[PDB]
Every structure is written in C-alpha cells, then in structure tokens.
C-alpha cells in the first residue's frame, strides 16, 4: 500500500492483549476456516453454553524455550498447553464439554548474520508414538499432557527396556514427525516457516477441528503444535549459538457445556 501497509507488519488484538510484528510472512488461516461459535443446526448438548469471551479469548504466553545447534524440536497440544491459563483453564476444568479455536503466534528473532529455519506445524489429532516395544498405546495421560512446558522431539528411537517400571512416555522421532510418517510431508498440515533471514514469527489461526461439534477438552487434544528445525541454527562462527523461541496462544470463539464441580486431574 502507498499509505505503507505491509504483509510483513501486523497487529493482532484479542481481549486486553495486542501483538505487533514487523517481520511477518503474512499469516495462515487453517483450511481457510476462521473460528466460529457452534451453530444451532450443528448443536448437540442442549444446556445454555457459557461464552467467557474476552476473559478467555486473549493472548497467553507460555514458557520460553531455547534453540541451539543441538535442538531436535518441540511439541505442544491444544487445549493442554493452555490448561492453566487464567479463566480459559478454569472454564475448561469446570465443564464436561468445551470447544475452541486459536490464534497461535510463534516468536523467534535473531539478526541479519544468523541463519536457520523453523518449520511450525499445526496438526489436527496429533497422535504421537510411544517409547515402548513391549506394549503399544501405552503413553500415560500424565506424559501425553505436559501442559505449557510441552515436549520435545528426538533424532533417535530408543525403546524403554524397564518392564517393571515402564516410563510410559512418547518417543517422537523428528524425521518421522513423531508419528511414523515423513517430516518432509508435514507441509500438507497448516504451517508457516520462520526462516531467520526472512521473518521472525509464525501466525496460525486455527478453527475448532474435530469429528464432533463439542467434546471433552480434558480427555482430548484437538490440535498439536510441532516446531522443528528444518535448517539448523547458525551464527557467525560461534560453535554454541542460542536464540529463544516464545509461544503466545489465544483461544477464540470458545464455548463450554455441562457445568459441574471442578476437575482435579492427576498430572504427575
């Protein structure tokens, strides 16, 4: 635009929160569908829904992780990563049912002299593979759900050989996208790439996706966020560079049904 508007410079405002960026690579709307509230013709639970609106549909920043030459990748699940985030988390644990869309904003700046590229993927039903070759489908609820800290990918599959006290955790191998399919094909999922010379962030607007209009947020994650180094971090001639990666995520058009007493999960 001759008034200066740019593909690269954006402002997102949800609730009492605003994100600015000056080095964006446009932004993605997954499957071309913007988030929406549940329509009457698709509705299923009959009780009046709660719609917390600005109290929950706002940007929550998770703990910042660190990208280094040895990093194999990171993953998070939604809504799990937001289970402890203000009134969104509260609404989630107080209700049997809940649905939500999200704006995901991944942040990672560096310099004109650094290089590297992060693949940022939003995967519907991101089922990951377990650490076991003695029992399949054995990852425990506690290990499947890290909350905001997320998990990581590994370059090596290593089977849990403790049969007495199994680890019961995932063992997500990076080139196999943590799920037995090739990473080079993850681009069929809604994605952006943070290539440090080009941009310093990724923005993905995710609709609620499921085979149901609404479901148990506590039992089921709708989306997975997978961040993998497609091209490794590098800087000048330093052997041990580091740059931070920050995740900020906002729920959108979230509504809840089936109010009762609060859920108190076994998370450890």
């Amino acid at each position: 635009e001759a008034c200066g508007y740019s593909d690269r410079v954006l402002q997102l405002t949800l609730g009492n929160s605003t994100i600015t960026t000056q080095e964006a690579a446009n932004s993605v709307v997954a499957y071309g569908r913007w988030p929406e509230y549940l329509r009457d013709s698709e509705a299923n639970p009959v009780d009046q829904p709660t719609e917390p609106d600005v109290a929950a549909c706002r940007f929550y920043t998770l703990d910042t992780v660190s990208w280094t030459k040895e990093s194999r990748g990171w993953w998070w699940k939604l809504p799990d990563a937001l289970r402890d985030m203000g009134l969104f988390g509260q609404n989630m644990y107080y209700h049997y049912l809940g649905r939500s869309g999200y704006t995901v904003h991944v942040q990672c700046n560096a310099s004109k002299f650094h290089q590297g590229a992060l693949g940022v993927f939003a995967v519907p039903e991101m089922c990951l593979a377990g650490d076991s070759n003695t029992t399949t489908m054995y990852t425990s609820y506690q290990n499947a759900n890290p909350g905001e800290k997320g998990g990581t990918f590994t370059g090596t599959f290593t089977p849990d050989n403790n049969q007495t006290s199994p680890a019961r955790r995932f063992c997500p191998v990076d080139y196999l996208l943590g799920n037995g399919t090739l990473l080079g094909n993850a681009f069929v999922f809604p994605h952006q790439i943070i290539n440090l010379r080009t941009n310093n962030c990724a923005t993905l607007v995710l609709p609620y996706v499921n085979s149901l209009s609404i479901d148990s947020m506590v039992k089921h994650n709708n989306w997975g966020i997978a961040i993998l180094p497609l091209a490794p971090l590098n800087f000048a001639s330093e052997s041990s560079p580091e740059i931070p990666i920050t995740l900020t995520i906002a729920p959108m058009c979230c509504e809840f049904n089936g109010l009762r007493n609060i859920t108190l999960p076994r998370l450890q």
Binding site: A25, L128, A129, N133, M137, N179, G180, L204
Partner: protein, 283 residues
Amino acid sequence: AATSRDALPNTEASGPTHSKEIPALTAVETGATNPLVPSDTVQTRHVVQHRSRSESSIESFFARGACVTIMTVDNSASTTNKDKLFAVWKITYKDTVQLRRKLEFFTYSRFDMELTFVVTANFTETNNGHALNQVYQIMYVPPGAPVPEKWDDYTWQTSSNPSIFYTYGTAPARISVPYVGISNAYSHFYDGFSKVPLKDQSAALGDSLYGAASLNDFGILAVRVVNDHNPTKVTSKIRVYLKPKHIRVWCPRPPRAVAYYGPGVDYKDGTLTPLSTKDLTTY
C-alpha cells in the same frame, strides 16, 4: 459445478517477457504453495487439454474391496478338552495394512460400508471320507449383545442381531451398512484418552490407553458352521472384504512411512529407515 471427469485447463500460448511481474520468485515461509503453470516461466503453445482427474476423486480412489481379516472356523466334534471351532473378530480396518494406509491419508471420514465375504473350505485329514455342503452363519454382534460362547448356544438365534446364512459354493455374500458412527465422522486418529485420571482416585482406576476411544468401538462378527459334525474334519476360512462407498474425507495427512506396529501410531525399533542410499549429484 466442476465435475471430477471434466477436462483440466488448456495451456494457453505465451511469448517472451521482460517485466516487473515476478511469478517465479516467491516465499514459502508464508505457508503457501506458488500457484504456477508452465506459461509463467517458459514460452508455451496453445494446447487443448483432454485429460481429467476422474480416477483420483475420493470416491474413485477408494472404490475397491480390500481384505480386512481372515476368520477360521471348523466343523469338528466337540470333545471334553476341545470344542467345535467358531470364530469371533473385532470389526476393524487395522488388522491388515493396505486399506488402513489409504484411509490414513486423511484424519476423518464418512462412508457407507460394503462388506463382501469369500468362503473357502478344505479337508485336513487324510481319510477318504466326506462332508456334505456347509452352511455358514455370520452374525454381527454389536457392543452390548451377548457374544457366543459355544457354536450352538442360544445367541445364534439372532432375533435382533443381523445374520447372514451363507451356502458354500454360492456367490460371495454381501451386505451394506450405513454411516454408523456415534460422531459426525469416523476418526482415523484420536489424540486423547477415554478417561480423565483424577487425583482423588487411584492411578489404576483412572488409567486408559492412549488414543483409544470406545473399547468395543463397533462390535464383533461371530462365524460358525451351522452343520453338525462329520466323521471327517473340514476347516474353513472366511475372508472379509471392506469397500467404503459414498465417501467423504477431511484433513489430509502424510502417509504411513514405516511399518505399522499395532492399532496406534507406534513404531518398532529396527524398522525406522524407509529411505535408501542415493548420492546428491547422481541421477
């Protein structure tokens, strides 16, 4: 209104170019694929395109019966340490690999299911003897109905369960079933658990398998030889073929790249090297 059997777009003739229009240059970071066609980067002639994508419509891609299981039954005398063998199979497409991999190009699906049954029998013992033509009963028992415990017990009465009585040597049996899911679509992947572990509850009590939803998702097929036994032993097998008709699919996925290892997405050590050696600058 564009149909699957319509011809694809014609190539339009294009000549030399020298401008500020830059189709070839792009930025994959955006998450988009550059929509180019040959006339954007080379000189083209006019071609009237007749080819179509008719055979790769979702319906056409799936319009085939695939074997999902082999059930074994026999017609032997039940004796104190061993009974006449009837078969019980939990309905699924995950016991075999080929249809499973095709459905798993997608996250969710809706379809009407066509099941076709191929039935073959043979003698197992040496003796001369004979058997007369067998009739088979394929009974569907849905989650909650009494599963048969003996080849001849009351459950084979089927007052409400659907059964097929198939006569050996006649055309393979076939039935259709509608979209029977308890959700708006079948989930090929469920990133969740069927139970929330509560703190106030024992770990055992809150536990459940990762990625599993209803323990008896679709029920069972129970198959038996209806005939009484012969002096001679005859073993039979029922091969089940599944075809998804009237199908819709959502959310594409990368296909399975390493061997299947159970009903989930798990993989086995030693099978994780799909790709083969090939040098970067070797054609």
